[PDB]
Design a binder for this molecule. Structure first.
Ligand SMILES: *[C@@H]1O[C@H](CO)[C@@H](O)[C@H](O)[C@H]1NC(C)=O
Ligand SMILES: *[C@@H]1O[C@H](CO)[C@@H](O)[C@H](O)[C@H]1NC(C)=O
Ligand SMILES: *[C@@H]1O[C@H](CO)[C@@H](O)[C@H](O)[C@H]1NC(C)=O
Ligand SMILES: *[C@@H]1O[C@H](CO)[C@@H](O)[C@H](O)[C@H]1NC(C)=O
Lengths: 162, 162
């Protein structure tokens, strides 16, 4: 199996993601998105693209990306500080269940995987999530995929921020 | 007029704030919240306080505060990185109108004002907002209140983030 052959799952309407806030990552590829919270935001009233935004928040640092739909269930992200483009797909989503929400998303470079983000608001207890992670690790460079919360900083009274 | 005598307006239910996302500050007191976007987040499924969170996002930096209600329409904030406490009130709110949402909030130390945050998603066009700012500037230390967006960094394709 190669990264281009992974499933490209249907994307839930944006409000379903917003209603899942806040999420934390359970499995990631590089160190970048360890100990990170995901927040979805609807488009600004003054946005001329009317693209929603994904926020990746790691302590007191934040990466924001406006995103729009592309072909074959892709998300086309524009990183808001640089204007750099990223193309993402979902292996699966399972939002707004009786046990909360999860999904696994990935970014390829051709046949290899270069980033991975499995998110949930149920502490990774959706059996689909572990299952998806085990499939993603089988594509080239998927050996890097690892648990995202092994050594996160101590909290100071909040639950999704530190 | 002193800061303790400013109005302490009714607080809209949290979902009305969430539905106003994203907001930007129009008037602030210190330099801290210049060029800053406000995002409200519902409590995490795993939060034992079930407090919502306010996010103040300034470029790639973020301050998060879980907050709960206190006496006399106060918001009691817990800054998520330090555990430091802040007590806030609203001069007014005007959320989810046909021209969007605005509010002005403040933080006193006794008779003086120490921080001010007027937010909107309509570029400060709610006449209540300019009016509230003109009242707040009359309390001790209100002379510091100023326009929040005079010199913000260039955007790179997004609208509420940079
Ligand atoms: C994929 O890798 C190649 C080789 O380094 C690079 O030129 C390209 O920009 C990368 N990203 C893609 C195709 O999104
Ligand atoms: C979340 O899952 C991790 C890993 O299994 C575990 O160590 C932790 O106790 C869980 N947290 C809760 C609140 O159940
Ligand atoms: C108000 O100012 C006094 C004097 O510096 C300080 O001790 C106190 O902690 C400040 N903050 C309050 C009352 O919230
Ligand atoms: C927002 O208001 C400022 C100050 O009046 C103005 O310079 C700017 O052009 C306004 N933006 C829009 C999109 O109307």
């Amino acid at each position: 199996l190669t990264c281009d052959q992974l499933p490209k799952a249907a994307i839930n309407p944006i409000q379903e993601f917003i209603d899942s806030n806040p999420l934390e990552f359970e499995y990631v590829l590089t160190e970048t998105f360890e100990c990170t919270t995901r927040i979805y935001v609807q488009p600004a009233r003054w946005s001329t693209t009317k693209a929603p935004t994904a926020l990746d928040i790691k302590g007191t640092q934040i990466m924001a990306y406006d995103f729009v739909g592309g072909p074959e269930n892709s998300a086309h992200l524009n990183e808001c500080h640089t204007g750099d483009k990223q193309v993402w797909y979902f292996q699966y989503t399972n939002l707004l269940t009786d046990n909360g929400s999860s999904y696994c998303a990935y970014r390829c470079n051709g046949t290899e995987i270069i980033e991975y983000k499995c998110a949930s608001n149920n502490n990774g207890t959706d059996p689909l999530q572990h299952q998806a992670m085990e499939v993603a690790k089988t594509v080239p460079n998927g050996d890097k995929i690892h648990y995202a919360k092994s050594n996160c900083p101590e909290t100071h009274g909040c639950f999704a921020f530190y």
